[PDB]
Amino acid sequence: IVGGYTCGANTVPYQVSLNSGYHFCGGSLINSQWVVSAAHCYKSGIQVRLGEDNINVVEGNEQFISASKSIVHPSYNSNTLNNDIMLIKLKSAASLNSRVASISLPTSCASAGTQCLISGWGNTKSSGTSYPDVLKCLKAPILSDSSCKSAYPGQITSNMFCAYGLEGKGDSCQGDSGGPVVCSGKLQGIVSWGSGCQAKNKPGVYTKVCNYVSWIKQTIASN
Ligand SMILES: [Ca+2]
């Protein structure tokens, strides 16, 4: 997260870190057994880390639980990033508490102009590289679809939305991928792609979670 703020420990209790020997992506806890992330975060050998603030220090509220299965959306296209969503099942249910909590799925799609909360452990520089240890947060508005399409001609599908996010937060960044975009208390986006982090005229692009609620529900009912 570039241009954001320190969230505060466990203030984003649905935020997870995906670890394969190192943090590589975020995700969102949607119930005690399932995490939503980006399909482009897929790999084998995932450990889900819940209850994190500093990802480099064991602080006493963590739960580390290996994934038993990952399910990439059936129509994910890694070239275009269309349908950039995956589900990760935990080998054992998380213990839900004040520091480890699920986020609701949306009933309706969010509105242009709504301020959302984006979070993660990704790069905090637009130019160059610096990785935080504690969870970072950004408040960012959803942009109009016409604004989003003008920023990325020929690339924005109905399964994506943009969120300065045009002037350049100056955004989400490498290592935030897969993490949440929460608007009005619902998981509305997944950190997906953009051009750099320009953080002029290149806001972040996010998977539009409201399009996937049926798939999520049906998948978790059978797996
Ligand atoms: Ca920790």
From Swiss-Prot:
Its cofactor is Ca(2+). InterPro entries: Peptidase_S1_PA (IPR009003), Peptidase_S1_PA_chymotrypsin (IPR043504), Peptidase_S1A (IPR001314), Serine_Proteases_S1 (IPR050127), Trypsin_dom (IPR001254), TRYPSIN_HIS (IPR018114), TRYPSIN_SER (IPR033116). GO terms for molecular function: endopeptidase activity; metal ion binding; serine-type endopeptidase activity; serpin family protein binding. GO terms for biological process: digestion; proteolysis. Disulfide bonds join C7-C137, C25-C41, C109-C210, C116-C183, C148-C162, C173-C197. Residues 1-221 form the Peptidase S1 domain. Subsequent cleavage after Lys-125 leads to alpha-trypsin. A cleavage may also occur after Arg-99. Not sulfated on tyrosine residue(s). Ca(2+) binds at E52, N54, V57, E62. Substrate binds at D171, S172, Q174, G175, S177. The keyword Secreted applies. It comes from the Eukaryota. Keywords: Calcium, Digestion, Disulfide bond, Hydrolase, Metal-binding, Protease, Secreted, Serine protease, Signal, Zymogen. It is found in: Secreted, Extracellular space. One of its GO terms (cellular component) is serine protease inhibitor complex. The active site is at H40, D84, S177. CDD domains: Tryp_SPc. It is an enzyme of class 3 (hydrolase). Gene3D superfamilies: Trypsin-like serine proteases (2.40.10.10). Pfam families: Trypsin (PF00089). Its EC number is 3.4.21.4. Belongs to the peptidase S1 family. Interacts with SERPINA1. This is Serine protease 1. It comes from Bos taurus (Bovine). The gene is PRSS1.
